[PDB]
Amino acid sequence: LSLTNSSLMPTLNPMIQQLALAIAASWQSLPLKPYQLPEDLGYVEGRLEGEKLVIENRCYQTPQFRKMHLELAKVGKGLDILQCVMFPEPLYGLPLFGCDIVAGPGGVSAAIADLSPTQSDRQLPAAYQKSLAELGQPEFEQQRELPPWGEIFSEYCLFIRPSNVTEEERFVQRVVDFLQIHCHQSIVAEPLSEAQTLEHRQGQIHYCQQQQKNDKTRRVLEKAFGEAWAERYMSQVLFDVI
Numbered sequence: 001l002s003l004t005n006s007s008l009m010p011t012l013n014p015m016i017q018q019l020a021l022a023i024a025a026s027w028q029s030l031p032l033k034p035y036q037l038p039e040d041l042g043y044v045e046g047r048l049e050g051e052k053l054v055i056e057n058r059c060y061q062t063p064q065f066r067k068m069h070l071e072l073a074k075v076g077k078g079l080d081i082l083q084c085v086m087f088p089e090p091l092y093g094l095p096l097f098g099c100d101i102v103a104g105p106g107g108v109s110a111a112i113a114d115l116s117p118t119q120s121d122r123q124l125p126a127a128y129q130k131s132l133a134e135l136g137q138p139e140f141e142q143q144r145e146l147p148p149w150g151e152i153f154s155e156y157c158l159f160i161r162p163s164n165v166t167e168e169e170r171f172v173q174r175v176v177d178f179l180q181i182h183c184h185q186s187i188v189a190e191p192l193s194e195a196q197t198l199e200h201r202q203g204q205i206h207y208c209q210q211q212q213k214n215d216k217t218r219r220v221l222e223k224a225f226g227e228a229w230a231e232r233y234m235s236q237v238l239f240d241v242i
């Protein structure tokens with residue numbers, strides 16, 4: 001988690017670097033243990049007929065979070081990516097923290113962050129609704145509309161092209177705020193009933209199945225590794241259906 005031994009970090013877009021540091025800082029004092037990905041994956045690289053894709057995978061778990069996954073990636077010299085999902089243990093009924101950042105030489109093209117629901121009513125728990133409302137509406141100049149599979153995201157989801165450094169920093173601060181809320185709620189959550197645990201598990205499964213519809217990720221993986229590898233990666237490493 002120190003990221004001090006990351007080979008990608010020094011070379012990534014500055015907003016991605018700050019967000020990776022913020023996520024690692026939020027996690028570093030939790031009761032973590034490593035989470036072994038399929039084939040105990042860590043670093044991976046591949047190329048076919050075009051650019052090389054390199055990915056650093058870090059993955060942890062705690063009693064409240066089944067899987068805490070931070071990926072950093074680069075395609076060639078032209079494209080940097082940060083992905084993070086905290087998959088909740090359904091027993092505690094927490095939402096799914098996620099973010100995705102994509103940047104080119106011209107700057108960040110896409111910045112997405114959310115606390116996504118797992119309840120059948122598609123609502124965040126009441127305490128999250130209350131704390132999120134208290135943050136107020138952030139202003140961003142270049143909003144982007146989610147694709148249809150993005151129905152899984154909450155009404156608090158951010159999806160923008162940052163317009164300037166002020167917006168990059170506002171976005172990172174909102175992600176910090178989401179993580180502060182989420183980590184706090186993880187302390188004040190208890191084991192749920194078996195029926196409720198089941199309901200939350202179903203919400204998480206749905207989230208993973210919808211994330212697998214994102215062809216933006218799939219094409220990048222396929223161009224470097226091919227169709228079969230990408231399908232394994234997306235279904236077994238990124239968005240495993242529990």
Ligand SMILES: C=CC1=C(C)/C(=C/c2[nH]c(/C=C3N=C(/C=C4\NC(=O)C(C)=C4C=C)C(C)=C\3CCC(=O)O)c(CCC(=O)O)c2C)NC1=O
Pocket residue numbers: 055071073081082083084085097098099100102109110112113114146147150159214216217218220221
């Ligand atoms: C190896 C990993 C990985 C790759 C290759 C990847 C690529 C990637 N994700 C993107 C978009 C996106 N990414 C997401 C969201 C997410 N995506 C997620 O993995 C998570 C957890 C969320 C949300 C919490 C959304 C909503 C888009 C826009 C999709 C679209 O425009 O169709 C884009 C398009 C950027 C743009 O339109 O400006 C690329 C190239 N993202 C990655 O994470």
